[PDB]
Structures are given as structure tokens and as C-alpha cells.
């Protein structure tokens, strides 16, 4: 079934998110610094690539954090605000972690795009392939 | 009356917003560039100082604009998201205008703070004095 197939797919995404292994990609190093992410395998159009992983927060805590980060003007803008059902959240990925989602550069004609993925009530912001991706390509996102 | 007095005050703010004269302040120029704003008169605690004026938009248009601005990495982050009643807006002050609200620097211990001011249904983000302000002080905001 076509419904049946989509149900399988949602389950496989849920396991990938949960476990957060982030396989099939690697850090692009320039001068000892991570500055992008490269695909190390193929992705088909519509495949899960990676979560934009940070801390999920509602607007109140968002404004508190925003005020803190305003005290350091070196800080990148890693706060992604969005709407889910009747509720308004923000994924805050400001802190430096080993997670790769937050290191993927933006491009107008990228190969990854954003999607909201629900796991029993909690929204997760994930990047899926917007086209077939070749092993060795830089991963590049748009909205 | 104390209620009566507060009602007067809301009316005076409404006229100031509407007209947008932005008096009692001036641009701080360094090397021909506006880099802050100075008070040219006194403000009492709780007085209206200035609106953070840009374009008011709901989340949908916000994400569209955000995607555009990602194409120029020189762009400042001027998008202020917030919650009003059951609705979620953003004031976008990214475009360079002659408006002074967007030129006021941030400080942890500033002299201006944010407030939402409603005028028959539309929320406006305004800066009011968080303490008595002396003529000649730099205006500095926190949240
Ligand atoms: C500051 O550096 C980044 C910020 C990011 C971000 N920041 C939050 C979004 C705000 C964009 C900043 N604009 C500039 C002006 C208006 C706000 N959102 C995202 N994603 C969103 C979901 C998919 C990936 N990815 C980001 C990757 C970033 O760096 C990658 C390595 N150069
Ligand atoms: C990029 O420069 C500015 C951004 C502003 C902003 N940007 C929107 C808020 C986002 C702050 C950026 N952070 C950094 C990391 C997470 C997001 N909001 C405000 N106000 C909000 C209401 C009262 C004044 N005022 C701003 C003044 C700014 O420059 C002043 C001259 N240096």
C-alpha cells in the first residue's frame, strides 16, 4: 500500500532521530575548523539527512536566551523559530556541540530542505534531501 | 483617577507611534556612520522613547524573508519574533531606513526596555525608559 509505505518511512525517520547516529556524512575541515558537511553516501530525493538538533523551547524561554546571547556579539544566530499546530517553538542550536545539522551551510539552490517531523506530539526540525544527492557533495540547506 | 491617568498615557503613546516623529534623540555618528542613538532630552521612568519600527509580519512571511536574507551573509539579524494574545508575529527591521529605533545598541544594564503596545488590535514593539534618563546619555536597550 502507498499509505502502508509512508507509515514505514515515518518509523524509520523516528528511529534515526531518536538514535541520532548521523551517518553518511562528515565534517569538511579547513584550517582545523569544521566549516561544512560533506555527504559520504548517496541520498535519494525525500530521504532523511539529519536533524537540526539543539534545544526545543517555547517563546518565553526563547526571549530569555536571546537576551543572554545579546551580551556576546561574536554569537551566531542559530535560533530557528517556527509554528506547530496552535503552538510556537524555537530550536536553539547556539551552543557548540558535535552535532552536524548545525554545521551545514545554506545555499539558495541547496540539496537539503527543512521539514517538521512529529514524534508523538514533539516537533523535530529535520533536513531531507530535495533531490538525489551524490556521495562527495557538500550538503547545503534552504527552507 | 489612577485608571483615568493610565488611560491618558496610552492615548499619548498612540499619537507618538502614529506620527512617528522620534524627537528627543539623535544619531551618534562615528566616521560618517550612524552607530548609536543619544538622548537629547530627559526621559522619566516609564516614558515612551521610540518604536522598534520595521514591518510587522506573521510566521509564514517571516520564513520567506528569512530565506532571502540568508543569500546575503553581511545581513544583520533584525527580525524580532514574539507572541501576542493567541497570535505569533515578527517585527522585521532588516531594511535600512531613517528610523532610529533599530540603531539603538543593546546593553545588559540598559536604560530602555521592550513593551508591547496595542492600538486597536495591532501590536507595536516600543522601547520605554527603564529608569530616569539624562539628556546626553546613549540610549541602550535590553528585553
Ligand atoms: C550562524 O550559522 C548558522 C545558522 C543556522 C541557522 N540559524 C537559525 C535561522 C536564522 C537565520 C539567520 N537570519 C539572518 C537574518 C535574519 C535571520 N539555522 C540553520 N538551519 C535551520 C534549519 C535547517 C538548518 N542552520 C544554520 C547553520 C549555520 O551555520 C552553518 C555553518 N556556516
Ligand atoms: C543587528 O543589529 C541590531 C539588531 C536588533 C534587533 N534584532 C532582533 C533581535 C535578535 C537579536 C539577535 N540574536 C543573536 C543570537 C540570537 C538572536 N532587535 C532590536 N530590538 C528588539 C526590540 C528592541 C530593539 N534592536 C536591534 C538593534 C541592532 O543594532 C543596533 C546598532 N548596533
Swiss-Prot record, chains A, B:
GO terms under cellular component: chromatin; cytosol; nucleoplasm; nucleus; polytene chromosome
Chain residues that bind S-adenosyl-L-methionine: 33-35, 78, 105-106
Effect noted on mutating residue 66 to A: Strongly reduces affinity for histone H4
Ranges for domain SET: 23-143
Induction of its expression: By HCFC1 C-terminal chain, independently of HCFC1 N-terminal chain. Transiently induced by TGF-beta and during the cell cycle.
Domain note: Although the SET domain contains the active site of enzymatic activity, both sequences upstream and downstream of the SET domain are required for methyltransferase activity.
Protein name, per record: N-lysine methyltransferase KMT5A
Native species: Homo sapiens (Human)
Whole-protein residues included: 235 to 377 of 393
